[PDB]
Scaffold this active site. Structure first.
Site, PDB file in Angstrom:
ATOM      1  N   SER A  28       4.128   2.892   8.080  1.00  0.00           N
ATOM      2  CA  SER A  28       3.740   1.794   7.189  1.00  0.00           C
ATOM      3  C   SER A  28       4.901   1.260   6.345  1.00  0.00           C
ATOM      4  O   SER A  28       5.701   2.026   5.798  1.00  0.00           O
ATOM      5  CB  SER A  28       2.604   2.230   6.256  1.00  0.00           C
ATOM      6  OG  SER A  28       1.451   2.628   6.982  1.00  0.00           O
TER       7      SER A  28
ATOM      8  N   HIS B   2       0.804  -1.214   0.000  1.00  0.00           N
ATOM      9  CA  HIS B   2       0.000   0.000   0.000  1.00  0.00           C
ATOM     10  C   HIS B   2       0.844   1.273   0.000  1.00  0.00           C
ATOM     11  O   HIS B   2       0.333   2.361  -0.260  1.00  0.00           O
ATOM     12  CB  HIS B   2      -1.006  -0.016   1.168  1.00  0.00           C
ATOM     13  CG  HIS B   2      -0.464   0.487   2.472  1.00  0.00           C
ATOM     14  ND1 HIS B   2      -0.257   1.827   2.726  1.00  0.00           N
ATOM     15  CD2 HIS B   2      -0.167  -0.162   3.621  1.00  0.00           C
ATOM     16  CE1 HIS B   2       0.138   1.980   3.978  1.00  0.00           C
ATOM     17  NE2 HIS B   2       0.199   0.788   4.544  1.00  0.00           N
TER      18      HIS B   2
HETATM   19  C1  LIG Z   1      -0.976   1.095  14.320  1.00  0.00           C
HETATM   20  O1  LIG Z   1      -0.164   1.535  13.214  1.00  0.00           O
HETATM   21  C2  LIG Z   1      -0.661   2.263  12.135  1.00  0.00           C
HETATM   22  C3  LIG Z   1       0.221   2.307  10.968  1.00  0.00           C
HETATM   23  C4  LIG Z   1      -0.119   3.105   9.786  1.00  0.00           C
HETATM   24  C5  LIG Z   1      -1.369   3.867   9.745  1.00  0.00           C
HETATM   25  C6  LIG Z   1      -2.290   3.825  10.917  1.00  0.00           C
HETATM   26  C7  LIG Z   1      -3.629   4.580  11.009  1.00  0.00           C
HETATM   27  N1  LIG Z   1      -3.985   5.584   9.961  1.00  0.00           N
HETATM   28  C8  LIG Z   1      -4.611   5.326   8.789  1.00  0.00           C
HETATM   29  C9  LIG Z   1      -5.025   4.062   8.395  1.00  0.00           C
HETATM   30  O2  LIG Z   1      -4.366   3.066   8.695  1.00  0.00           O
HETATM   31  N2  LIG Z   1      -6.172   4.002   7.694  1.00  0.00           N
HETATM   32  C10 LIG Z   1      -6.602   2.630   7.559  1.00  0.00           C
HETATM   33  C11 LIG Z   1      -8.111   2.454   7.713  1.00  0.00           C
HETATM   34  C12 LIG Z   1      -8.556   0.990   7.567  1.00  0.00           C
HETATM   35  N3  LIG Z   1      -8.053   0.402   6.274  1.00  0.00           N
HETATM   36  C13 LIG Z   1      -8.492  -1.021   6.208  1.00  0.00           C
HETATM   37  C14 LIG Z   1     -10.000  -1.065   6.063  1.00  0.00           C
HETATM   38  C15 LIG Z   1      -7.838  -1.853   5.115  1.00  0.00           C
HETATM   39  C16 LIG Z   1      -6.598   0.608   6.003  1.00  0.00           C
HETATM   40  C17 LIG Z   1      -6.228   2.083   6.182  1.00  0.00           C
HETATM   41  C18 LIG Z   1      -4.857   6.489   8.033  1.00  0.00           C
HETATM   42  C19 LIG Z   1      -4.338   7.550   8.799  1.00  0.00           C
HETATM   43  C20 LIG Z   1      -4.254   9.008   8.602  1.00  0.00           C
HETATM   44  C21 LIG Z   1      -3.674   9.881   9.646  1.00  0.00           C
HETATM   45  C22 LIG Z   1      -3.182   9.294  10.911  1.00  0.00           C
HETATM   46  C23 LIG Z   1      -3.235   7.831  11.113  1.00  0.00           C
HETATM   47  C24 LIG Z   1      -3.797   6.958  10.056  1.00  0.00           C
HETATM   48  C25 LIG Z   1      -1.925   3.016  12.096  1.00  0.00           C
END
Ligand SMILES: COc1cccc(Cn2c(C(=O)NC3CCN(C(C)C)CC3)cc3ccccc32)c1
Ligand SMILES: [Ca+2]
Lengths: 52, 234
Positions: free
Chosen positions: B185, B42
């Site tokens: 990520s 991704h």
């Molecule tokens: C705990 O560690 C992490 C590592 C990387 C990112 C994040 C959380 N995260 C995500 C995210 O992740 N969206 C998911 C929603 C759900 N989808 C699924 C439905 C597939 C994927 C994208 C977008 C995002 C934007 C600003 C701050 C944190 C964020 C947490």
């Protein structure tokens, strides 16, 4: 807790059972030692090692 | 990374940073060898073209061990899907080999069977990256690491509003405000065993960051070991 289930079978790294007995192995860049348990590096920068 | 400590000199040498045309870091990666980088699929859509930086711990201060590397081959898992983030894994082949040193070294690739019953049964794993220090905050200029407990698979699924496939696993805390976050990520999730660090996961996603009742979702590396070796063989 028997074989590999008991303290990784005394193996430094990979431990697997083949015929009620332990067999140790190592990752790339390492070689099983004389005791057949420890893993000795082969180069200046073996994998998974921190240099503090 | 939310919470945790900053990676000290020589502490997280397998950390790689994907940077865009403007030299901004958007994702992490793990060094597997002089030519290969493990990251999340991704992350590949984040930039139309990126490079790989290693040996970096402070985005604004050259420590002398930094080094940029261009990507020659991008190997993405054909089953990856943006709808669920399942199969969120990719391997990068670099044009020029990495030179190992103080802050630049590969993490170890374990054997599947041993990794699942021994590594993933340990109490904690280590995640690191240049990601946000708070959910709505900005990217960190300092490389950080965080010890994260392995989460029982049942608790994991019951806490997730999204599907948790067999290629993912939970790690982190239920309420404690520590967790990986946006920007981390593709980064390393490694498990220590007798002073040796093994790659056990890829930072994938999460619902917010450090939120209560929520965990960090990681790609289960042990499910792609054979796949990884194949991508490196050619
Ligand atoms: C705990 O560690 C992490 C590592 C990387 C990112 C994040 C959380 N995260 C995500 C995210 O992740 N969206 C998911 C929603 C759900 N989808 C699924 C439905 C597939 C994927 C994208 C977008 C995002 C934007 C600003 C701050 C944190 C964020 C947490
Ligand atoms: Ca720097």
């Amino acid at each position: 807790r028997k074989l590999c289930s008991l303290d990784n079978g005394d193996c430094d790294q990979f431990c697997h059972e083949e015929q009620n007995s332990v067999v140790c192995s190592c990752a790339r860049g390492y070689t099983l030692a004389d005791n057949g348990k420890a893993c000795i590096p082969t180069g200046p920068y073996p994998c998974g090692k921190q240099t503090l | 990374i939310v919470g945790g400590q900053e990676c000290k000199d020589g502490e997280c040498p397998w950390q790689a940073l994907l940077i865009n045309e403007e030299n901004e870091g958007f994702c992490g990666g793990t060094i597997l060898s002089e030519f290969y980088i493990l990251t999340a699929a991704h992350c590949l859509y984040q930039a139309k073209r990126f490079k790989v930086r290693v040996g970096d711990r402070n985005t604004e201060q050259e420590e002398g061990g930094e080094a940029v590397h261009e990507v020659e081959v991008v190997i993405k898992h054909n089953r990856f899907t943006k709808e669920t983030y399942d199969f969120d894994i990719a391997v990068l082949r670099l044009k020029t080999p990495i030179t190992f040193r103080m802050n630049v070294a590969p993490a170890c690739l374990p054997e599947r069977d041993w990794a699942e019953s021994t590594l993933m049964t340990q109490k904690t794993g280590i995640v690191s990256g240049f990601g946000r220090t708070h959910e709505k905050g900005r990217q960190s200029t300092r490389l950080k690491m965080l010890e994260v407990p392995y989460v029982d698979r049942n608790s994991c699924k019951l806490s997730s509003s999204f599907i948790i496939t067999q290629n993912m696993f939970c790690a982190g805390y239920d309420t404690k405000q520590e967790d990986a976050c946006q920007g981390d990520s593709g980064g390393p999730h490694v498990t220590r065993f007798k002073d040796t660090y093994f790659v056990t996961g890829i930072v994938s996603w999460g619902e917010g960051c450090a939120r209560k009742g929520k965990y960090g979702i990681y790609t289960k590396v042990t499910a792609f070991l054979k796949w990884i070796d194949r991508s490196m063989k050619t």
